């Protein structure tokens, strides 16, 4: 059991205790996914309006 890296200030202190040693999607790609979902919504709404028109 050893205390290392002891730092003190007027606000408090910090230290470490060792007990044992061991043994991205681009902006375009996001906007594609969001636009794709929009188009799928638009397709489903269009089918609804076609059904209602019938």
């Amino acid at each position: 059991m050893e205390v290392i890296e002891l730092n003190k200030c007027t606000s408090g202190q910090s230290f470490e205790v060792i007990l044992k040693p061991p043994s991205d999607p681009s902006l375009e790609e996001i906007q594609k996914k969001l636009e794709a979902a929009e188009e799928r919504r638009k397709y489903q709404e269009a089918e609804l309006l076609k059904h209602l028109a019938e």
Binding site: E45, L48, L49, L52
Partner: protein, 423 residues
Amino acid sequence: REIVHIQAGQCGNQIGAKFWEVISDEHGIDPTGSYHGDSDLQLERINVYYNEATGNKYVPRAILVDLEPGTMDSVRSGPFGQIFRPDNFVFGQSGAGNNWAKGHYTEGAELVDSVLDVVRKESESCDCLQGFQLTHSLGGGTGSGMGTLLISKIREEYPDRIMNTFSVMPSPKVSDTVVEPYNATLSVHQLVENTDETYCIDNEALYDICFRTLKLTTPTYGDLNHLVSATMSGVTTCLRFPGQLNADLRKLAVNMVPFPRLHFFMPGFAPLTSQYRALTVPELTQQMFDSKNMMAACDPRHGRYLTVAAIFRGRMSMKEVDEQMLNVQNKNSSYFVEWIPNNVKTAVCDIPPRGLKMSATFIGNSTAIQELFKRISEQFTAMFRRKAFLHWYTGEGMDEMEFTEAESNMNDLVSEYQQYQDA
């Protein structure tokens, strides 16, 4: 925020008027539209159902529709008749003769554009329209036929808004004409496609509650409608009063409807008593799950609950509530599907309805509702196999094939419920 209320035909307008009497009293609105309450909780969400007119008056966001003037003359003379926007009465003179085809295809078609003009005016001054609630019966002609025509047109104009109905199902025990099963079978298919939530109010159940429980030897439509307006007030509490819930119509439908076609709910209410006695929380909880307090004449023990909302009102122990909700779930352990975790919602609102220290409204999405549709289907088939009374409809331009399809559609719906009852 805002909800647009529509009420159509005789039943729809008589139940609608009582709903507005009940909730105006709850929000402190007198029959002149003047606010005279004593709690800011009454005004916090008044805008959901009321517009504020310039004179500090509150006016229901309500459209009253009929194909004959009689019932709407009765509403206007009624208790709260002066609160409604006079522009919002939309009526013809012909009537619909208890005939879905007249409501949906001939007489109703002549009037529907004028109703949509009023809907559009109300929607236009909505800061952010939640959606629409329609009250009607399914056994007549105007509420049934014109009402579902209205729902279809509203969906075309506002495809992304929620649509709810409070729908009165016919029963031969409380019947005006023999063609009611025809009108109701035609309407149900409309509702399967074009509502997000349908509160199924069965006139058989209402009569049996008035007769057996309330000890009303000779129930009247008014006695039936007292039950419905009390239930409607309870189901909409979470919209009308500041809870911690933060519920709107879409949230309600998302949480109650796991499959798009299975959106037909059994409502219930407690207490119903034939009274000054204190009702304890155990009694409230036990009553609201009793089949006898349910307003769709379906035995829930014959099916399984997909989802349940239980709304308690008044000042009571939340701790007692939860203990009883747990207890009643144990007693009904076999009657909840196990593949929707936590599918029973408990909600408490502190404002009691008038004349009760506490009450409870039950909303069940149960597969037992299939019994209601089977009942209608049998009555429909008993006549349709002999083509009886069909001339009333073919005389309006309908073909027999449209009856075949509506019957096939309802039997499909029944099979759908039976599929999930056995999952």
